[PDB]
Every structure is written in structure tokens, then in C-alpha cells.
């Protein structure tokens, strides 16, 4: 292999002399202790090396050397119900070695190579075997793990291992020309995998909130980006969503964050079940942790790991979110290194090819016919941190160019601890008009007319609130102060959710239809009964307002039925009114 | 000349960035072929030469390159186009190869991709009044044929709606002109630079939906794509078209998705070689590099044919000072701005008719072409809705209660017009019934403030009420 | 009524407008300010190449 | 100055897991210590508070508080402008309830309190309103708690 030694070292950044040979994006080690570190610029005999450890210590004429190869992960069985580091090293195996602290220079394989799987062919000799088909395939928890080919393998089949059980590193099937394919293979994490078709999304990803789910959608191959102040709610979502949404695989990739919050999901998760099939929640989760104390050149590299892990799970036919806890410290790494390189930055300390990265992460995603003939769906969910809250940060802007839908959140609201506290007005989505007919045939046949008309009291309520901010609201006639106490009924009734009660922390779609019928019913009695000269007042002390705003609170086995109370109650209360 | 010759002895690879030292023979601008060590070829321009080194941008990515096996070999020296008149039909990538299935085009000619400038005196002046149907535009804001008309667009705004609405209705109307020549089909160009799968689907299914790809040229570039490509697709998007309008006599409509993805690449690269920025850190020659795209359409007098653009832009915020809307509002020849406060009240398309404009609107529209009514009433329309959208300001201050007559008049005109006018759906309006909306509009005021309208045409279409079309 | 409504809301407002224009373009000075210093840093290093 | 966008409380607010925020408003009133609850936060208040761990009622008392005084600041801001005869009876409850807060919850001395009597200063206050009014605690907790008056006097 190439060899030399180590010529200057400043920061994170290491230029070595005597390379001549190495190639772009490929992998060094560094120093006696074997620190990773990745080849970006070459310039004659030298090379430019970023760590992804801590480069205290180094001294100058160390040796470094290239292993010829670029950044991959191992994708094979044993991946769930994991804990990974930024560059794919598990932490419960690091902890065993290293105590309570993370020490450089610790090397561990990313799959177990003891465990045994319990095999089962499916060729035979004299089958001719291309990219991305079905070799056989290993239990897991509660799933099939399919072993796949590798997509650039073709070949005939000379022999195939029994059904029985293995590791990973035995060879099982043994092709003609003298490849032997393993349980496992290695990938390039930034080259996007192989696939046939990429189709139109049709189907929604359900989040289990009321306001995403109902004003907002978001497909099951689409992108979301939800921005906002800190403490304003994106941590809370995300989780929800890796909670109770209906995807089979949740890769939750925390890039530059706390602590505190992966060790609240690696401790929570084991105990609750997921909405699908049973069993414990963990099972069905990939974490990939990179702190925020952690080195920062590894943040880089965690979120194409994340995707690179998303998008094998999509070639086996399985539906897959991806979460990203903030892609601003992404973009704070790459503007550390860019200004280490001594490059011009373009806005805000920023290096020009911000927005390209960007867009070739997001653009990972989408609902594809895979190379075996299955479907598979990845949705990607991306949180933006901008600075002091101003959405005119590049980052942002950059942003919103791709996603399909924007969910943006205020702090005025999440002062007044009105959570979700997304902002009604300043939000959209472009999938809208796509899942109508899945809304028509799965909820209801009216469900598109009611989410309208919600819409439009939310846009008539809104209207009226700078007229009554100035003038009063006793001053406002009997027709719009209707309107605003409608207003503040879908405001606190609806669109308020709250996360951590044992029943409001989930909706279905349908009961979430059977609320908007309550509200628009009240509405339409309350319109019709104030031409016959009622008092504001006399409806607003109606026992039967209680029951509306009680009504998310009703478990989902009891809704049904407490629908039709509510309904036939509001009938009655308006028909025997004054 | 037949033979290759190698240059090894590249001593510097970083970024977009390569250099090569005994490269003397290299001319300026020219294209290149870098080989890999295994085997890979990847194109590459001359940036910079000089008797000691030179200086090349790779299109593709530079991963696996190395500075002991790489090797550049010249393929040719200026940077040409083999066109044909059989690429109607056909798909292309960023850099002119196909991604169809199909075998390649066999050139009958190869030309420059930098183009040359028009001489003012072969030019003529755009006559031809085109009815894109849409009354905001062809009232209003009318497009010629021969014109550079931008769409001034947002993040969540239906743009390329509006586009494909545009190229699927567009039509002239040789009776009223009085030409009586039979209207052939728009051929149609279609650059992308940078689009989404999103986008590209919607845009394939329409082009599919309404037949015209049997017309159509298009040259993808998709997000995942290399950022350097994006320099050379425009440039060929536009060799193309001006050959087919100036050989063969065809009436090209050309398309470009974003061009903020363009001025994205130009800053890289500038950025890469520390030019002197202008604001925001684009580089000082973006007028320069944008004038030599966006003036290659017009007409040319002694020829059929003729060259239309429309590019699409989505300015980086709400923001029309941004230095990419500024220099292209200085180069086009008017543009069309979209509003997101129309785009919330379920209007579509959501055209903002004051701060839109259209430059060449006078040479195409009065007596002899569309109607001799035209140009009064459109200014009157605009001063009657630039009244009324000051009014409402004065009644968010002081309460709509203390209005008088008149202002309350304008604010139902004004409201009015934008739910009549402005929205309308779909569907393909002639120009007759534009005009007979806009003179349904204008009667609900008095007779004697319509200043700018002479009493002759008072007289004649005065009077009309408005639910005798929409009641 | 309308005293009140002016000094409440609409003088804040302004002064809070014209504090974010005023720290965005002193941003946008200090920017330019570290572009010069590298040109010449450039200059000077250039005119030492063989002395 | 008092800029809750500056680079150091923004960064630091990225960071922690809350923040206490003084008040100037509160300090020029006398009341001392002058924090402001509404852009306080404590992330991790859920894990320490609840069944067996303090009290039952605490995180549903903590969220009607909140409502309550978010409701009440913005009907005083309302009055700073309009004036004080528009209200109605349930704006004037909500006015009260937001200055009977300021000088009785958050005005202390140097006098050490326990979780407990904080929590029955709470429910005083939480009893000027109508049950109705009380939409974020539950039917049980409120035939357990409400109906409390002033004993300090
Ligand atoms: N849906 C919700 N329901 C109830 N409480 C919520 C909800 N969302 C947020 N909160 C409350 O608001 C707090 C906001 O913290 P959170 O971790 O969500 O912030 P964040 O937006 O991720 O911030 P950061 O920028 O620091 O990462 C939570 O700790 C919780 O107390
Ligand atoms: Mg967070």
C-alpha cells in the first residue's frame, strides 16, 4: 500500500508526505494509534487528511497509511436493535472495552462475527444470478432478512450451503468464475444504490398527529423539513413519529445533539411495542449517535451512513423513515473543514457547495421498483436549527428548494405551551392533492370537503384578528364573534396535541375525521341559530362545548360511540334553545 | 488532426479543480477526456493555460482520481455540437448523450456551443401577438413572439404549472392580425438544471398527456447529477434551438427550469478560483455569463423561424433585490411575478399584476392586431386596482366604517378583480372574453373617472354587467 | 385609543426593524473586510516567489 | 441588552436542557425574584414529577397555570390599548387571575417553601376560575383539590 508520514498537523487536519499514489475519498490511518482519516485534496507528493478522531498528541513523522479503499458500511443481518457510532461502530461493544468513556483509536467489526443465523437457500445450482436478487433468507425479529447480491455481481451458481446455521463471514453460495458471496457486503456510503424505476407517490405516511396528518400530508416516498427555534418542539415530533408511525424500519440519526436524548430513546424504546406487529419498539429501530462533544468531522460522515443503512433496508420491499436530528451541525462540520482548506466561503462562513450536498441527500428518497422486482419506500424527515430563528439563513433556503413539504414552527406559540406549535399560516405541502383518492376510499368519501372547510374557518379567523386586536372584540357583531369563538374551539380542540398523556399522544385518521364532524356540526347549528336573534352568550355557557373539548382525550375504543352522544347531544341542545 | 496525445504530470487535485503542467499545446477553452486508473473517462474544460501549467474543471466528481495513473488527452479544441434535425423526440443528459435506449445522432453539421452575437442590423423587430390564455397575461402583460419573458417564482409556488399551461394553450391568432398564414405547432426545448423527480414526473406525464413529445428536445439534469454540468446545458439547449428556427423554419419555445441552480455552479466554480465577488458573493462577470444565455432569442429578418424563452427563477427569498432577480429583470425583456399572499386565498394562477411587466407589450396589441381598445384598458385596469390596493391599506388604519363612496367602490372593485380576473382555473380563455370581463370589471365605475379610456370606446363598450357572463 | 395603539406597537416595531438591517449589514462590512485581507495576504506572497 | 437572539443565550439555549429567564418588568415592580415563567422552560421536568414522585397532579396544574397566565397577559395587553370597561366577566376573571399571580406565586423573600405548600398556593389561585375553564386537568383531580381560598392573610 501507499506509506508515508505525517508533515504538518493543525486542528482536525493532517498533510502527509511521501502519498504519491493515494487516490481521492479514500481511507487513511493515522499514526501509530490507527486514527480514520479520508483523503480530500492531493497536490504532488503530499495529501490533505481529515480526521474523524481527536488529533491531539500527534507528533510529526508518524506513519500514515492508505487502505486503498473509500468510506463503506457492512449491511447484512444483525443490524437492528442497535446502537451505531458516527463511522459505524457499535458503542455497547465499545463500553466493554473502554469503560464509561470514548477513547480514540478502538477498532471493532460492525456486525457480530459469532452469532448464528439460521439459514435457508433459495437457488439452486445452475441459476443465473444478477444484482439485487434473493440468494435466501435469515429470521430476524419477527422479520425475513433477505440475503441479497451485491449490485454489481452477475454469474451462475456452482454450489449453495445447505440449510443450517452459520455466521456472517461463511461463504453460502460460490459462483462459477470463483466469487463467493458472504451474508454480508461492503458499500460506498456516497454512492446512492442501484434501483429499476422510481414511481409516483400514493399512499400517506402517517405520523399520528392531527395537524400533520390532516392540514399538512406528507407521501410515503416524500421529504419533510421542519425549522425552528430551539425549544420549540422538533425533538418531541420526531420522536412521535419514530414512536407511532406506521413505517416497518425507523433509522434515527442523531447528528450533533445531546446526550441525554439518545439515552432517553435507547432506555424507553425496549419497553413499549410497536403499532404493527407486537413486540418491543427497539426492534424495529437503527441508531446512529454522534454527540455533540464528539468529534465533529464525524458528523459528516454519520448521516450518509444513516441513508446508506435506509436505502439497503429499501432494496429488501421494506417502507423506511429516516429522522435527522439537525443538518445545520452537517453544515457547521463542513464550513470547520472548508475554513482548515483555506477556501472562500460564500454566505455566512458557508463554502459554495452547501446547497449540492444538500440536495443530493434528500434526493435519496422516493418510492422505487428495487433491482429484485419488490417496492420499497424511503421518506426523509430533516430538522433545520437556524440562527436566533431567521429563516434566511442559507441553510434554510437551501432547504426548501427540495423538501415537499414545510413544516415551520413558532415560539410565540411554544411560549404559550401550545404544542405542536406549528405555524398554520407559514406552512405547506405538495402532496396534498395527490392522496385525495387514498382519503376518499380509507377515511371517508366527504373527508377532502371537511379538511377545506376547516381550512377556510382557520383563514376567516385569522382575517378577523387584526380587526379585533385594535378595536375590541364587544364591538365585533353576533356573526364574528362566532367565528372567532369557532376559531378558538379548532384552535385549543384540534390542532393542540399533547405528547405525553397516555391517550392524546396518538390519533387515527379516523377519529380525527369524527372530531372535524363535531366541530363543523356545532358550527352549522350555532350559524343558524343566531339569525334567530340568540345571545353570543347564551351559547357559549352550553354544557355541551365541554364535550367537544373533551373529546381527544377519549380512548380509541370508546370514540365511536361517545361520537354519537356528542352528536345527538349537540341536536338536542339546539333544537331545545331559546 | 488523428492522433491522440497523453498528459501525465498532473501535480494538483482538489475540488473542480486539476492541473497539468506541460500542457502548452492545450488551447484555450478547449475540451478534454481524464482518464482514471481503471479505466474510467470523465470530460473536462480549459479554464486557464500557460507555458507553465494549465488549468482544467472536471465536470463529474473526483473520486478515484490519483496523481500517478491519471492521465488528459485533448478530444477536441472548441467546444462543439453535433445537431441534427433528428433529435426531435429524443432525451439527453446535461452534456448531449443519450439516456433514451436509442443509438446516437449522426451530425449533419457541429456548431460552436458558445454561440456568436446577433448583429442588430440582420434582427427585426417581434410583431406577433401570442394568447398564452391566461387573462393576466394577455391582457395585461402580453407576450410577443421573439421574447424573454422570466416567471418571477417562490419555494411553494405552482411555477411550472403555469409553464406547462403556457406551452400547452399557446397559440396565435392569424385573423385578427389579418396574416391568415395556418399556425404550425410550437416546437418545444427543454432544459433542466438540477430538477427533482417530483418535478421532472409532473412535467413528463403532461408532455406525455398532451402529445407533444414528438416535438420536444430535452436535456435533463437531475439534483443527484454533477454540479459542473449544469455550465454547458442551457448552451446547448440553445444551439439546438437556434438551429432548428434558423435553418429550418420552425417556431421554438424554449424552457429553463431554474436558474438559480445555474448561478449556484457559477459561484462554485468563481468561488474555486477567487474571483472578485459582486454582492452576496456571486461572482463580478454574472452579468456577463447571463447576458450570453438569455440573448440568444428573437427574430432575424429574412427567415420564418423564431426563438421564444420563457426560464423560470425562484428567488432565493420573497426578496426582488436579490442580486440573480436583479441582473435578470436588467437583461429580459419584462418578467411575470408570482404572489404567495394570492397563492394562501386559493386563487390560481396566482399572478401579481403590478410589479409584472412585459416590454414589447406596444408593438403587438392595438387597431389591426387584437383591438383597438387594448392598451386603454389595461391602464386603466392597473390605476384602478393600484387605487384600490392603496384604499385597503387606509382601511386597515382607520377602520372601513368612516370610508366614503368612492373608496368603498374601489375596495369591492379591487376585490372583485381578484376574484374574477385573476382567477380562473384551468380553463383557456380567448381574448374576446378577457376583454369582455375586463369591460364587465370597468362598469361598476362611474362613467366620468375613467380618465385614461377615450369616449369613443366609452361609448361603444360601456355598460355591461358582470352576471350576464358569471351569473 | 390610537396614542396608546401608536406607542405601543408601531414604534417597537420600526426599532426593532431598523437593529436587524443595521447588524446585517455590518455582517455583510466585516465579510467584505476578511475577502480584502486574503487578496493582499495573496499580493504580498506573490511578489516573493524567486526572489 | 436584553436580546434573547444574540449568538451566546441562542447558542447556549441549543445546548442545555432549559433556561430561567429574569424579568425587567417584574424587577422595576418590586417583586423579586422577577422570573418570567413564559419563556422559562425545564426539558426535563416529566422525568422527576408524577405518581409516586411528588405529587399526582403536578404536570396537569403546571400546564393549566401556564394557559391561565398566557390568557391573562394577553388580555392586559389588550387593555393597554383599548381600556378597561370593553371586558367581559371572564376577561376581567382572567385579569385577575394574571395579577393575583405576580404578587402571591412568583413574589417571595428570602422564605424557603415546600413543593406542597406551592402546590396548595397553586390550586388557590386555579380556584378563581370556573370549572369549565379548567380544561387540561381531569374530572378526578378536581373533586380532589379545587375550592381553596387564601389562608394566608
Ligand atoms: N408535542 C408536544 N407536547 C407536549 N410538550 C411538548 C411538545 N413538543 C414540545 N414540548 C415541550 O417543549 C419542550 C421543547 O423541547 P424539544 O426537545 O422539543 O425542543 P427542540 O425544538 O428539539 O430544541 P433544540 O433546538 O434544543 O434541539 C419539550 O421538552 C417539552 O417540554
Ligand atoms: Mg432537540
Redesign the pocket.
Given at each position: 500500500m501507499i506509506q508515508g508520514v505525517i508533515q504538518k498537523i493543525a486542528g482536525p487536519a493532517v498533510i502527509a508526505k511521501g502519498m504519491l499514489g493515494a487516490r481521492m475519498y479514500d481511507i487513511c490511518k493515522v499514526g501509530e494509534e490507527g486514527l480514520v482519516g479520508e483523503i480530500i485534496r492531493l497536490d504532488g507528493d503530499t495529501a490533505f487528511v481529515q480526521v474523524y478522531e481527536d488529533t491531539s498528541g500527534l507528533k510529526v513523522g508518524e506513519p500514515v497509511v492508505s487502505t486503498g479503499l473509500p468510506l463503506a458500511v457492512e449491511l447484512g443481518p444483525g443490524m437492528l436493535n442497535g446502537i451505531y457510532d458516527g463511522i459505524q461502530r457499535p458503542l455497547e461493544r465499545i463500553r466493554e472495552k473502554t469503560g464509561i468513556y470514548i477513547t480514540r483509536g478502538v477498532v471493532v467489526h460492525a456486525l457480530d462475527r459469532e452469532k448464528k443465523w439460521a439459514w435457508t437457500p433459495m437457488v439452486k445450482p445452475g441459476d443465473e444470478v444478477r444484482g439485487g436478487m434473493v440468494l435466501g433468507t435469515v429470521p430476524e425479529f419477527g422479520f425475513t432478512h433477505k440475503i441479497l447480491v451485491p449490485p454489481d455481481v452477475r454469474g451462475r451458481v456452482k454450489e449453495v450451503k445447505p440449510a443450517g446455521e452459520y455466521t456472517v463471514e461463511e461463504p453460502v453460495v460460490v459462483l462459477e468464475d470463483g466469487t463467493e458471496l458472504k451474508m454480508y457486503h461492503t458499500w460506498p456510503v456516497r454512492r446512492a444504490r442501484p434501483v429499476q424505476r422510481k414511481l409516483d407517490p400514493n399512499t400517506p405516511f402517517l405520523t399520528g398527529m392531527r395537524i400533520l396528518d390532516v392540514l399538512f400530508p406528507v407521501a410515503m416516498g416524500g421529504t419533510a423539513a421542519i425549522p425552528?427555534p430551539?425549544?420549540?418542539?422538533?425533538?418531541?415530533?420526531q420522536q412521535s413519529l419514530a414512536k407511532w408511525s406506521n413505517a416497518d424500519v425507523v433509522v434515527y440519526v442523531g447528528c450533533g445533539?445531546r446526550g441525554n436524548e439518545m439515552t432517553d430513546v435507547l432506555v424507553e424504546f425496549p419497553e413499549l411495542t410497536d403499532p404493527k406487529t407486537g413486540g418491543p419498539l427497539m426492534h424495529r429501530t437503527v441508531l446512529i449517535a454522534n454527540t455533540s462533544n464528539m468529534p465533529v468531522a464525524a458528523r459528516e460522515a454519520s448521516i450518509y451512513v444513516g441513508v446508506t443503512i435506509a436505502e439497503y433496508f429499501r432494496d429488501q420491499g421494506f417502507s423506511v423513515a429516516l429522522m435527522a436530528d439537525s443538518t445545520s451541525r452537517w453544515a457547521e462540520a463542513l464550513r470547520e473543514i472548508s475554513s482548515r482548506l483555506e477556501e472562500m466561503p460564500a454566505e455566512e462562513g458557508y463554502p459554495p457547495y452547501l446547497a449540492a450536498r444538500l440536495a443530493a441527500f434528500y434526493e435519496r428518497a422516493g418510492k422505487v421498483i428495487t433491482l429484485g422486482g419488490e417496492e420499497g419506500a424511503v421518506t426523509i424527515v430533516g430538522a433545520v436549527?437556524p440562527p436566533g430563528g431567521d429563516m434566511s439563513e442559507p441553510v434554510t433556503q437551501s432547504t426548501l428548494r427540495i423538501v415537499g413539504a414545510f413544516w415551520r414552527l413558532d415560539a410565540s406559540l411554544?411560549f404559550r405551551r401550545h404544542?405542536?406549535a406549528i405555524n398554520w399560516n407559514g406552512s405547506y405541502s405538495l402532496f396534498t392533492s395527490a392522496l385525495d383518492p387514498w382519503y376518499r376510499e380509507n377515511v371517508a368519501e366527504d373527508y377532502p370537503e371537511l379538511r377545506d372547510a376547516i381550512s377556510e374557518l382557520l383563514q376567516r379567523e385569522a382575517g378577523l384578528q387584526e380587526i379585533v386586536q385594535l378595536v375590541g372584540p364587544d364591538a365585533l357583531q353576533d356573526a364574528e364573534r362566532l367565528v372567532i369563538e369557532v376559531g378558538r374551539i379548532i384552535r385549543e380542540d384540534f390542532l393542540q396535541?399533547?405528547?405525553?398523556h397516555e391517550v392524546d399522544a396518538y390519533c387515527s385518521m379516523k377519529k380525527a375525521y369524527g372530531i372535524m364532524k363535531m366541530i363543523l356540526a356545532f358550527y352549522k347549528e350555532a350559524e343558524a341559530a343566531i339569525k334567530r336573534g340568540v345571545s353570543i352568550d347564551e351559547i357559549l355557557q352550553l354544557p355541551v362545548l365541554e364535550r367537544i373539548g373533551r373529546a381527544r382525550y377519549v380512548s380509541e375504543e370508546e370514540f365511536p360511540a361517545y361520537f354519537e352522544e356528542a352528536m345527538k347531544e349537540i341536536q338536542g341542545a339546539f333544537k331545545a334553545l331559546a | 488532426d488523428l492522433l491522440k496525445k497523453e498528459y501525465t504530470g498532473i501535480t494538483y487535485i482538489s475540488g473542480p479543480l486539476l492541473f497539468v503542467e506541460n500542457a502548452k499545446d492545450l488551447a484555450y477553452g478547449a475540451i478534454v477526456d481524464i482518464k482514471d486508473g481503471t479505466g474510467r473517462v470523465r470530460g473536462g474544460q480549459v479554464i486557464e493555460v500557460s507555458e507553465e501549467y494549465a488549468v482544467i474543471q472536471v465536470f463529474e466528481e473526483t473520486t478515484g482520481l490519483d496523481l500517478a495513473t491519471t492521465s488528459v488527452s485533448l478530444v477536441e479544441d472548441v467546444a462543439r455540437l453535433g445537431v441534427s434535425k433528428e433529435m426531435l423526440g429524443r432525451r439527453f443528459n446535461g452534456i448531449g448523450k443519450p439516456i433514451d435506449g436509442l443509438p446516437p445522432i449522426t451530425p449533419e453539421k457541429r456548431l460552436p456551443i458558445t454561440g456568436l452575437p446577433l448583429n442588430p442590423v440582420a434582427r427585426r423587430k417581434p410583431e406577433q401577438f401570442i394568447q398564452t390564455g391566461i387573462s393576466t397575461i394577455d391582457v395585461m402583460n402580453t407576450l410577443v413572439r421573439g421574447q424573454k419573458l422570466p416567471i418571477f417564482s417562490g419555494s411553494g409556488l405552482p411555477a411550472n404549472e403555469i409553464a406547462a399551461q403556457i406551452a400547452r394553450q399557446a397559440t396565435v391568432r392569424p385573423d385578427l392580425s389579418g396574416e391568415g398564414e395556418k399556425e404550425e405547432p410550437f416546437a418545444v426545448v427543454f432544459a433542466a438544471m438540477g430538477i427533482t423527480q417530483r418535478e421532472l414526473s409532473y412535467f413528463i406525464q403532461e408532455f406525455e398527456r398532451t402529445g407533444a413529445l414528438s416535438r420536444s428536445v430535452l436535456f435533463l439534469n437531475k439534483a443527484d447529477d454533477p454540479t459542473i454540468e449544469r455550465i454547458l446545458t442551457p448552451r446547448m439547449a440553445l444551439t439546438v434551438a437556434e438551429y432548428l428556427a434558423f435553418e429550418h423554419d420552425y417556431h421554438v419555445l424554449v424552457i429553463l427550469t431554474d436558474m438559480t441552480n445555474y448561478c449556484e455552479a457559477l459561484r462554485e466554480i468563481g468561488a474555486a478560483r477567487e474571483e472578485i465577488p459582486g454582492r452576496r458573493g456571486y461572482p463580478g462577470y454574472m452579468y456577463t455569463d447571463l447576458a450570453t444565455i438569455y440573448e440568444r432569442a428573437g427574430v432575424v429578418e429574412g427567415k420564418k423561424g423564431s426563438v421564444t424563452q420563457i426560464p423560470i427563477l425562484s428567488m432565493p427569498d420573497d426578496d426582488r433585490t436579490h442580486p440573480i432577480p436583479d441582473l435578470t429583470g436588467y437583461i429580459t425583456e419584462g418578467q411575470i411575478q408570482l404572489s404567495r399572499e394570492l397563492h394562501r386565498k386559493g386563487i390560481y394562477p396566482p399572478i401579481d399584476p403590478l410589479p409584472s411587466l412585459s416590454r414589447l407589450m406596444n408593438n403587438g396589441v392595438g387597431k389591426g392586431k387584437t383591438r383597438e381598445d387594448h392598451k386603454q384598458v389595461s391602464d386603466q385596469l392597473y390605476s384602478a386596482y393600484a387605487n384600490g390596493v392603496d384604499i385597503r391599506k387606509l382601511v386597515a388604519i382607520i377602520g372601513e366604517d368612516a370610508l366614503t363612496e368612492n373608496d368603498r367602490r374601489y375596495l369591492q372593485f379591487a376585490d372583485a378583480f381578484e376574484r374574477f380576473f385573476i382567477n380562473q382555473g384551468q380553463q383557456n380563455r380567448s381574448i374576446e372574453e378577457s376583454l369582455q370581463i375586463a369591460w364587465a370589471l370597468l362598469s361598476m365605475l362611474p362613467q366620468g373617472e375613467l380618465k385614461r379610456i377615450s369616449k369613443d370606446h366609452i361609448g361603444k363598450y360601456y355598460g355591461q354587467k358582470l352576471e350576464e357572463i358569471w351569473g | 385609543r390610537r396614542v396608546n395603539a401608536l406607542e405601543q406597537v408601531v414604534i417597537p416595531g420600526i426599532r426593532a426593524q431598523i437593529r436587524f438591517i443595521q447588524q446585517v449589514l455590518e455582517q455583510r462590512e466585516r465579510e467584505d473586510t476578511f475577502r480584502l485581507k486574503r487578496i493582499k495576504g495573496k499580493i504580498e506572497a506573490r511578489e516573493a516567489e524567486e526572489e
Open positions: 425552528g430551539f425549544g420549540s418542539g422538533k425533538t418531541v415530533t445533539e436549527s411554544a404544542f405542536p396535541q399533547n405528547a405525553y | - | -
